[PDB]
Design a protein around this nucleic acid. Structure first.
Ligand SMILES: [Mg+2]
Ligand SMILES: [Mg+2]
Ligand SMILES: [Mg+2]
Ligand SMILES: [Mg+2]
Ligand SMILES: [Mg+2]
Ligand SMILES: [Mg+2]
Ligand SMILES: [Mg+2]
Ligand SMILES: [Mg+2]
Ligand SMILES: [Mg+2]
Ligand SMILES: [Mg+2]
Ligand SMILES: [Mg+2]
Ligand SMILES: [Mg+2]
Ligand SMILES: [Mg+2]
Ligand SMILES: [Mg+2]
Ligand SMILES: [Mg+2]
Ligand SMILES: [Mg+2]
Ligand SMILES: [Mg+2]
Ligand SMILES: [Mg+2]
Ligand SMILES: [Mg+2]
Ligand SMILES: [Mg+2]
Ligand SMILES: [Mg+2]
Ligand SMILES: [Mg+2]
Ligand SMILES: [Mg+2]
Ligand SMILES: [Mg+2]
Ligand SMILES: [Mg+2]
Ligand SMILES: [Mg+2]
Ligand SMILES: [Mg+2]
Ligand SMILES: [Mg+2]
Ligand SMILES: [Mg+2]
Ligand SMILES: [Mg+2]
Ligand SMILES: [Mg+2]
Ligand SMILES: [Mg+2]
Ligand SMILES: [Mg+2]
Ligand SMILES: [Mg+2]
Ligand SMILES: [Mg+2]
Ligand SMILES: [Mg+2]
Ligand SMILES: [Mg+2]
Ligand SMILES: [Mg+2]
Ligand SMILES: [Mg+2]
Ligand SMILES: [Mg+2]
Ligand SMILES: [Mg+2]
Ligand SMILES: [Mg+2]
Ligand SMILES: [Mg+2]
Ligand SMILES: [Mg+2]
Ligand SMILES: [Mg+2]
Ligand SMILES: [Mg+2]
Ligand SMILES: [Mg+2]
Ligand SMILES: [Mg+2]
Ligand SMILES: [Mg+2]
Ligand SMILES: [Mg+2]
Ligand SMILES: [Mg+2]
Ligand SMILES: [Mg+2]
Ligand SMILES: [Mg+2]
Ligand SMILES: [Mg+2]
Ligand SMILES: [Mg+2]
Ligand SMILES: [Mg+2]
Ligand SMILES: [Mg+2]
Ligand SMILES: [Mg+2]
Ligand SMILES: [Mg+2]
Ligand SMILES: [Mg+2]
Ligand SMILES: [Mg+2]
Ligand SMILES: [Mg+2]
Ligand SMILES: [Mg+2]
Ligand SMILES: [Mg+2]
Ligand SMILES: [Mg+2]
Ligand SMILES: [Mg+2]
Ligand SMILES: [Mg+2]
Ligand SMILES: [Mg+2]
Ligand SMILES: [Mg+2]
Ligand SMILES: [Mg+2]
Ligand SMILES: [Mg+2]
Ligand SMILES: [Mg+2]
Ligand SMILES: [Mg+2]
Ligand SMILES: [Mg+2]
Ligand SMILES: [Mg+2]
Ligand SMILES: [Mg+2]
Ligand SMILES: [Mg+2]
Ligand SMILES: [Mg+2]
Ligand SMILES: [Mg+2]
Ligand SMILES: [Mg+2]
Ligand SMILES: [Mg+2]
Ligand SMILES: [Mg+2]
Ligand SMILES: [Mg+2]
Ligand SMILES: [Mg+2]
Ligand SMILES: [Mg+2]
Ligand SMILES: [Mg+2]
Ligand SMILES: [Mg+2]
Ligand SMILES: [Mg+2]
Ligand SMILES: [Mg+2]
Ligand SMILES: [Mg+2]
Ligand SMILES: [Mg+2]
Ligand SMILES: [Mg+2]
Ligand SMILES: [Mg+2]
Ligand SMILES: [Mg+2]
Ligand SMILES: [Mg+2]
Ligand SMILES: [Mg+2]
Ligand SMILES: [Mg+2]
Ligand SMILES: [Mg+2]
Ligand SMILES: [Mg+2]
Ligand SMILES: [Mg+2]
Ligand SMILES: [Mg+2]
Ligand SMILES: [Mg+2]
Ligand SMILES: [Mg+2]
Ligand SMILES: [Mg+2]
Ligand SMILES: [Mg+2]
Ligand SMILES: [Mg+2]
Ligand SMILES: [Mg+2]
Ligand SMILES: [Mg+2]
Ligand SMILES: [Mg+2]
Ligand SMILES: [Mg+2]
Ligand SMILES: [Mg+2]
Ligand SMILES: [Mg+2]
Ligand SMILES: [Mg+2]
Ligand SMILES: [Mg+2]
Ligand SMILES: [Mg+2]
Ligand SMILES: [Mg+2]
Ligand SMILES: [Mg+2]
Ligand SMILES: [Mg+2]
Ligand SMILES: [Mg+2]
Ligand SMILES: [Mg+2]
Ligand SMILES: [Mg+2]
Ligand SMILES: [Mg+2]
Ligand SMILES: [Mg+2]
Ligand SMILES: [Mg+2]
Ligand SMILES: [Mg+2]
Ligand SMILES: [Mg+2]
Ligand SMILES: [Mg+2]
Ligand SMILES: [Mg+2]
Ligand SMILES: [Mg+2]
Ligand SMILES: [Mg+2]
Ligand SMILES: [Mg+2]
Ligand SMILES: [Mg+2]
Ligand SMILES: [Mg+2]
Ligand SMILES: [Mg+2]
Ligand SMILES: [Mg+2]
Ligand SMILES: [Mg+2]
Ligand SMILES: [Mg+2]
Ligand SMILES: [Mg+2]
Ligand SMILES: [Mg+2]
Ligand SMILES: [Mg+2]
Ligand SMILES: [Mg+2]
Ligand SMILES: [Mg+2]
Ligand SMILES: [Mg+2]
Ligand SMILES: [Mg+2]
Ligand SMILES: [Mg+2]
Ligand SMILES: [Mg+2]
Ligand SMILES: [Mg+2]
Ligand SMILES: [Mg+2]
Ligand SMILES: [Mg+2]
Ligand SMILES: [Mg+2]
Ligand SMILES: [Mg+2]
Ligand SMILES: [Mg+2]
Ligand SMILES: [Mg+2]
Ligand SMILES: [Mg+2]
Ligand SMILES: [Mg+2]
Ligand SMILES: [Mg+2]
Ligand SMILES: [Mg+2]
Ligand SMILES: [Mg+2]
Ligand SMILES: [Mg+2]
Ligand SMILES: [Mg+2]
Ligand SMILES: [Mg+2]
Ligand SMILES: [Mg+2]
Ligand SMILES: [Mg+2]
Ligand SMILES: [Zn+2]
Lengths: 112, 116, 14, 140, 154, 59, 101
RNA sequence: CGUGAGGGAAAGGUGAAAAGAACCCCGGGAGGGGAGUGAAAUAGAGCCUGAAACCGUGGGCUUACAAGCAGUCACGGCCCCGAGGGGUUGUGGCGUGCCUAUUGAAGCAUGAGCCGGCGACUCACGGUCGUGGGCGAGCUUAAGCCGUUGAGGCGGAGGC
RNA sequence: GUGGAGCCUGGGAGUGAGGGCGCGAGCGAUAACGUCCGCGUCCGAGCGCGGGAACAACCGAGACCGCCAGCUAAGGCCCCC
RNA sequence: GGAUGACCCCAGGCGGUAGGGGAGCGUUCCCGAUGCCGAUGAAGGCCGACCCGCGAGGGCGGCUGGAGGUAAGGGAAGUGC
């Protein structure tokens, strides 16, 4: 039995969150919580929420026990980009891409 | 009436790319680069089908030489012996005989020496 | 884009 | 029918006394032994030749004025880094390199050919440490 | 490219812009631009030689006769402008609706009765063409209409 | 200068290979002696306020 | 007890029971053909010079087939020359029954 | 956008029906997980189909002594599918991208980041051959007129 | 001498920047991967195949397809091969 | 050969740029169609190691998709990157 959450349209660049997500893939929910708490990255805040939301879904909707949860799968997909103008010298305009993340976390039960 | 492209180009591009599976980077993802790769691959195959007949005959000859020297003659002497004896067992089989059936290769060496 | 910055002159290969 | 391809064989060690042999005309015979082209089942994409043990490499022989005239060279990669050593010198210093360098030049370049070089064991002087392998004396 | 809505200004200078040369955006090489050799209004008609269409009318009729599919009828009994009247007539005449029929009659009431049937093509005699004869499996004509067909191939 | 520019696009193989050295290392964590919460070594415990055995700052 | 027979301009070692594909023979399936013997070996050695006079290898024609397709491609640079050709080589599948001698 | 004359876009589609998801859970929200609607919810409104480039997660094979237009031929190893086939690639052999322009290009000569879609020999009238038919010292109508309402016929002026 | 020979009438062209080599000359310096004619040949279009270490035009030879068969050409046969 | 592509047999040709010529594939649309295929699933998509074709292609099968498609034989072009 699995439980998941997906944070869609998180306004952060996928590459930057994946580093935070790579820390917790395969960890127990308790270790992943500790890691995220003391990770010095913006993406840590967003990943934590998806982690805790999927955990709530596990306990609340899918008859899974908190004391047995681990991160069976997690990944960051890229969503639609915010395109914005960056003005440069000599009358030239550049297009900053404000990229966007679909964060996903899937917990399972590690029996024993 | 108007005949827009429609499905024709994509189906043509997919034929090339499927032929291109297992290639490196864009050589299996980019249609242009897949086709470019396949031009070269098709000529190599025509060229190497010819080359295989040279590759194997070259291997057999080396193996025949080795088995001949065990009986104290070289390939040149052996072949000319088989010629004069009228033996036409080709090099593919002489190599199998040389390895699989040494008692038969021995008698073949014998007839070759005797012939001259 | 609407405006082209002029390119640098060449080195005078004269 | 497909041309026979042999299963893996236990390699055969042999021992050659280089004393008084012509450097080039021994090197070819060793290169051939190392390629296994003396075996009817010779196959070009596998190391299946012999392990060759050479002794008395110091007493190799050479014709003409090659002791003084033949030049081994190495390039360091640095400005002026062409070092030159004559056969005379090389024998007096690393005599197992004379035969070694001659055989290596007669092996195929590439990963297999380089593995074949590893199978040749050249020794200055009359003794070798491979008694455990019990090599077979050869009269090349 | 001349009839398209855009302007004739050059969008950027010929040289030194790092981009390709272009004139106006109406050129067929732009999206939304002109069409190179697309259709314009056309008259597709041509004058087929008279004797060829006369000979064809004959030969069309001749083909149906050669296979015994031409029926001349002298009158249309109960047919007074109702379809049920034409069917009942058609029944007594072998026109059972399993075959497409080209009905050629000057009688307006008979063409009225027959028009709506999927298997009947209505036609006046002044109208007999080969396409309608060939479109259909068997041909049926007035004696009055067979007179006109005979006249137009004389 | 004369504006150095990349000569070829970097392949997915070369791009990711350069990122061979990019994994975050997880933070150093140790249990706090007083409340058994997990926290970075050599810092006042943010969960109970203890360090070196004494309540240092209320949390 | 094997034999070296010659068929379709090529040579093959054959023993009783061998299923073997050769160039297409003009023979109805289920028929039996005699192949010429160049050499015999095993429990005795006979060496044709070139063909063993008495000997013969008996084969049963199981069927006829078309080989899996090779694509014969041709390309010439800077000249717009391309040629695509599908080739299937026809063959005949034989069962070796006995080696006469 | 341009002082102005002037220039001048992009942007269509849930479902039969809003039945457009009450209520509960995590969350500041956004978003999600359940519940519910529907024939269908990777039809959930950022909505039909949903290709490609491109980014990721998982798995099989593989790689840290090796020289490379990236493939091809051979054999061997491993994984998959059931005298065979598919995936992979370790060693051996061979191997100078594509297009364009040129006497001659892998060329250190041109063009192209890659993918999708748009993108260039046509039409009218006249001519000249060839060809399929009709008629043949003859052949043929034009504009029009009548009929039809996807029916054809008349019209000989004129042309060859 | 029956050949992708020849001749006649007609439809459609492209080409009208050649280049190397051999031989005969001119120009040049009995120089040039020079230049300009002539006869021939190849590349061009045979950057397809073998040899020549590698290499359009030197030597061998004109590739419809397939073969894990055989004889040769130039060139080769100590090892790389 | 049989009797004017009905298939067979024997022999020969089949490198190719500019270019000439031949035969075909596929796209849009019209007639064939008041028909026929279609929710027991249209077109389009994604696979396939299968079948046919020298090839361009065409089948067939599985998944997706959810409402269209269209034969033999012909006709016309905004027809293949
Ligand atoms: Mg940190
Ligand atoms: Mg909880
Ligand atoms: Mg700035
Ligand atoms: Mg400014
Ligand atoms: Mg940009
Ligand atoms: Mg950007
Ligand atoms: Mg960018
Ligand atoms: Mg983005
Ligand atoms: Mg188009
Ligand atoms: Mg691969
Ligand atoms: Mg590959
Ligand atoms: Mg790839
Ligand atoms: Mg591919
Ligand atoms: Mg790929
Ligand atoms: Mg890709
Ligand atoms: Mg090819
Ligand atoms: Mg071949
Ligand atoms: Mg050959
Ligand atoms: Mg040998
Ligand atoms: Mg001979
Ligand atoms: Mg022989
Ligand atoms: Mg054995
Ligand atoms: Mg610039
Ligand atoms: Mg010796
Ligand atoms: Mg070996
Ligand atoms: Mg000396
Ligand atoms: Mg215009
Ligand atoms: Mg205009
Ligand atoms: Mg306008
Ligand atoms: Mg305008
Ligand atoms: Mg204008
Ligand atoms: Mg103007
Ligand atoms: Mg203007
Ligand atoms: Mg310019
Ligand atoms: Mg310009
Ligand atoms: Mg510009
Ligand atoms: Mg540029
Ligand atoms: Mg441009
Ligand atoms: Mg540009
Ligand atoms: Mg441009
Ligand atoms: Mg311009
Ligand atoms: Mg333009
Ligand atoms: Mg323009
Ligand atoms: Mg437009
Ligand atoms: Mg528009
Ligand atoms: Mg035009
Ligand atoms: Mg037009
Ligand atoms: Mg016309
Ligand atoms: Mg009607
Ligand atoms: Mg009707
Ligand atoms: Mg009808
Ligand atoms: Mg500087
Ligand atoms: Mg500078
Ligand atoms: Mg400066
Ligand atoms: Mg600097
Ligand atoms: Mg700069
Ligand atoms: Mg790079
Ligand atoms: Mg990339
Ligand atoms: Mg990657
Ligand atoms: Mg890659
Ligand atoms: Mg890099
Ligand atoms: Mg870096
Ligand atoms: Mg890393
Ligand atoms: Mg502690
Ligand atoms: Mg075969
Ligand atoms: Mg090929
Ligand atoms: Mg070429
Ligand atoms: Mg090219
Ligand atoms: Mg090339
Ligand atoms: Mg060329
Ligand atoms: Mg080309
Ligand atoms: Mg080409
Ligand atoms: Mg073909
Ligand atoms: Mg303004
Ligand atoms: Mg304004
Ligand atoms: Mg305007
Ligand atoms: Mg709708
Ligand atoms: Mg609606
Ligand atoms: Mg419905
Ligand atoms: Mg709450
Ligand atoms: Mg919500
Ligand atoms: Mg959730
Ligand atoms: Mg929800
Ligand atoms: Mg249903
Ligand atoms: Mg779906
Ligand atoms: Mg749907
Ligand atoms: Mg719909
Ligand atoms: Mg969708
Ligand atoms: Mg989507
Ligand atoms: Mg992966
Ligand atoms: Mg080393
Ligand atoms: Mg290694
Ligand atoms: Mg290379
Ligand atoms: Mg091999
Ligand atoms: Mg296999
Ligand atoms: Mg393999
Ligand atoms: Mg390799
Ligand atoms: Mg190309
Ligand atoms: Mg090309
Ligand atoms: Mg140019
Ligand atoms: Mg030039
Ligand atoms: Mg290069
Ligand atoms: Mg380059
Ligand atoms: Mg270039
Ligand atoms: Mg130029
Ligand atoms: Mg170009
Ligand atoms: Mg650009
Ligand atoms: Mg790309
Ligand atoms: Mg494109
Ligand atoms: Mg034209
Ligand atoms: Mg004309
Ligand atoms: Mg005409
Ligand atoms: Mg006429
Ligand atoms: Mg006549
Ligand atoms: Mg007339
Ligand atoms: Mg000719
Ligand atoms: Mg001719
Ligand atoms: Mg023409
Ligand atoms: Mg013509
Ligand atoms: Mg020209
Ligand atoms: Mg001129
Ligand atoms: Mg000229
Ligand atoms: Mg000239
Ligand atoms: Mg000239
Ligand atoms: Mg010159
Ligand atoms: Mg010359
Ligand atoms: Mg001479
Ligand atoms: Mg002169
Ligand atoms: Mg030269
Ligand atoms: Mg000269
Ligand atoms: Mg001269
Ligand atoms: Mg010449
Ligand atoms: Mg040219
Ligand atoms: Mg040649
Ligand atoms: Mg050549
Ligand atoms: Mg020629
Ligand atoms: Mg060449
Ligand atoms: Mg070259
Ligand atoms: Mg050559
Ligand atoms: Mg060469
Ligand atoms: Mg060359
Ligand atoms: Mg030929
Ligand atoms: Mg020979
Ligand atoms: Mg010779
Ligand atoms: Mg050798
Ligand atoms: Mg033939
Ligand atoms: Mg040709
Ligand atoms: Mg067509
Ligand atoms: Mg349309
Ligand atoms: Mg209709
Ligand atoms: Mg039905
Ligand atoms: Mg249904
Ligand atoms: Mg279905
Ligand atoms: Mg369709
Ligand atoms: Mg359609
Ligand atoms: Mg298909
Ligand atoms: Mg489908
Ligand atoms: Mg409908
Ligand atoms: Mg249709
Ligand atoms: Mg049709
Ligand atoms: Mg029709
Ligand atoms: Mg039209
Ligand atoms: Mg067009
Ligand atoms: Zn604490």
């Amino acid at each position: 039995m699995e439980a998941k959450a997906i944070a869609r349209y998180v306004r952060i660049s996928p590459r930057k969150v994946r580093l935070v997500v790579d820390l917790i893939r395969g960890k127990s929910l308790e270790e992943a919580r500790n890691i995220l708490r003391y990770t010095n990255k913006r993406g840590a805040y967003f990943v934590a929420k998806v982690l805790e939301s999927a955990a709530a879904n596990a306990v609340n909707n899918h008859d899974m026990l908190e004391d047995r949860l681990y991160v069976k799968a997690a990944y960051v997909d890229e969503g639609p980009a915010l395109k914005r103008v960056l003005p440069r010298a000599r009358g030239r305009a550049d297009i900053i891409k404000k990229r966007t993340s679909h964060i996903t976390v899937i917990l399972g039960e590690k029996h024993g | 009436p108007r005949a827009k492209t429609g499905v024709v180009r994509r189906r043509k591009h997919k034929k090339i790319l499927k032929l291109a599976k297992g290639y490196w980077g864009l050589r299996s993802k980019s249609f242009r680069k897949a086709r470019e790769t396949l031009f070269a691959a098709g000529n190599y195959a025509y060229a190497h089908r010819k080359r295989r007949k040279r590759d194997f005959r070259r291997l057999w000859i080396v193996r025949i030489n080795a088995a001949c020297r065990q009986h104290g003659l070289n390939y040149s002497t052996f072949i000319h012996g088989l010629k004069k004896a009228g033996i036409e067992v080709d090099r593919k089989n002489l190599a199998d005989l040389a390895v699989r059936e040494p008692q038969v290769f021995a008698e073949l060496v014998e007839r070759a020496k005797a012939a001259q | 884009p609407v405006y082209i910055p002029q390119p640098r002159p060449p080195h005078p290969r004269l | 029918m497909k041309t026979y391809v042999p299963k893996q064989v236990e390699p055969r060690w042999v021992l050659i006394d280089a004393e008084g042999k012509t450097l080039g005309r021994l090197a070819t015979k060793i290169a051939t032994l190392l390629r296994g082209k003396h075996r009817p089942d010779w196959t070009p994409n596998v190391a299946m030749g012999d392990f060759v043990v050479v002794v008395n490499a110091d007493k190799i022989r050479v014709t003409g004025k090659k002791l003084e005239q033949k030049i081994y060279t190495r390039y360091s990669g640095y400005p002026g880094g062409l070092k030159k050593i004559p056969l005379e010198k090389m024998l007096a210093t690393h005599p197992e390199r004379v035969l070694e360098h001659a055989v290596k030049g007669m092996l195929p370049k590439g990963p297999l050919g380089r593995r074949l070089f590893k199978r040749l064991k050249v020794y200055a002087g009359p003794d070798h440490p491979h008694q455990a392998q019990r090599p077979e004396k050869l009269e090349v | 490219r001349g009839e398209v809505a855009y302007s004739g200004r050059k969008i950027w200078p010929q040289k030194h812009t790092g981009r390709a040369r272009h004139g106006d955006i109406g050129a067929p090489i732009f999206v939304g631009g002109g069409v190179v050799f697309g259709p314009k209004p056309r008259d597709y008609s041509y004058t087929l030689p008279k004797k060829v269409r006369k000979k064809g009318l004959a030969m069309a009729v001749a083909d149906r006769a050669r296979e015994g599919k031409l029926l001349l009828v002298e009158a249309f009994a109960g047919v007074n402008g109702k379809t049920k009247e034409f069917l009942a007539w058609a029944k007594e005449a072998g026109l059972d609706g399993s075959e497409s029929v080209l009905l050629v009659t000057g009688n307006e009431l008979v063409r009225r009765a027959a028009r709506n049937l999927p298997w009947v093509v209505t036609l006046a005699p002044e109208g007999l063409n080969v396409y309608d004869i060939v479109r259909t499996e068997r041909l049926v004509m007035d004696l009055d209409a067979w007179e006109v067909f005979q006249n137009r191939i004389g | 200068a004369k504006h150095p520019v990349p000569k070829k696009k970097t392949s997915k193989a070369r791009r990711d290979a350069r990122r061979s050295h990019h994994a975050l290392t997880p933070p150093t964590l140790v249990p706090c002696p007083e409340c058994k919460a997990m926290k970075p070594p050599h810092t006042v415990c943010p969960e109970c306020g203890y360090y070196a055995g004494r309540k240092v700052l209320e949390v | 007890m094997f034999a070296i027979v010659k068929t379709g301009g090529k040579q093959y070692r054959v023993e009783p029971g061998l299923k073997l594909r050769v160039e297409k023979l003009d023979a109805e399936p289920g028929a039996t053909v005699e192949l010429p013997v160049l050499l015999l070996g095993g429990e005795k050695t006979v060496v044709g010079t070139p063909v063993v006079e008495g000997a013969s290898v008996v084969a049963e024609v199981l069927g006829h087939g078309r080989g899996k397709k090779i694509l014969v491609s041709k390309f010439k640079a800077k000249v717009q020359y391309r040629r695509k050709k599908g080739h299937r080589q026809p063959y005949t599948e034989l069962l070796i029954k006995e080696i006469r001698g």
